[PDB]
Amino acid sequence: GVLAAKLWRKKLHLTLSANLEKIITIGLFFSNFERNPPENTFLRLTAMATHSESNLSCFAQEDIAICRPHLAIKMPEKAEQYQPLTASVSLQNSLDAPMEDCVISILGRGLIHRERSYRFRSVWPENTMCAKFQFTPTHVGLQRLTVEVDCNMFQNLTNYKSVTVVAPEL
Amino acid sequence: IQAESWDFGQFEGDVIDLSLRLLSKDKQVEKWSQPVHVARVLGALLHFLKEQRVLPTLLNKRRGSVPILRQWLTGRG
Amino acid sequence: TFWSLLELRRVFTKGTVLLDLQETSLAGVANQLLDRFIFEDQIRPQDREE
């Protein structure tokens, strides 16, 4: 609840006819913001209507989350222990700028020892990343692969997928 | 609602030793048979450690609870 | 021998280390070691199976 930064303000002057409902549509655009929101913050959108000298203002507020591109992980539901397993990871660049300084990390207890970070190419807007990773699961059970993507537009974008690693056939 | 994958890592090799070392700051060892007393003591101590060690504002990169516990208890990390 | 320590230092300088590996079988140790070998460009992916 701590106030981070003031991003956008907008003043309208309207005339409402008596006993008439009016709907005003306002576009909330990122490029209108006076500055980029700090990381891990949320958007407080407030409306305030004041008329003449009624000494009372209508007010409403809404908390808006900032939505980052979906990190899609494709991996078989079941995997054999001590056999190589391929997981493809895709991200669509839905921003207004290229994605630069791109680092992707993969980890998960029971599949990968500590973490392995890789660099993939810069992604131009409306293009897609499609990275494939090969690793051998070594522990039997219900495991989880965690993928983290870093760039100059966003950081610590994390998605996960669960894989059941089964014992080899006797 | 955004779900963030988290590695609790309670079965890491040093987490049990670190938890018992933290509990050892409580001198009512006779009460360690009681989960209520143990939970209260550890919650108070971990809140104290969080207030001592968490700094005012990568910096937001997280690898689960175990590195945070190690840094809170030892100052390294 | 002199050449023994010579080449041991030479391969240690670019060696692949897996420290505190949570493994309990030779197959798992070998698989993780070969994965880290590929990661550090020590071996090509076509050599991993052999």
Partner: peptide
């Protein structure tokens, strides 16, 4: 997939796996 991602030697989270056990 299509990408052949190149390894990135990073030690930003290296200390996150340093155990406290002597």
């Amino acid at each position: 997939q299509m990408e052949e991602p190149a390894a990135h030697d990073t030690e930003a989270t290296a200390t996150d796996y340093h155990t406290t056990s002597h």
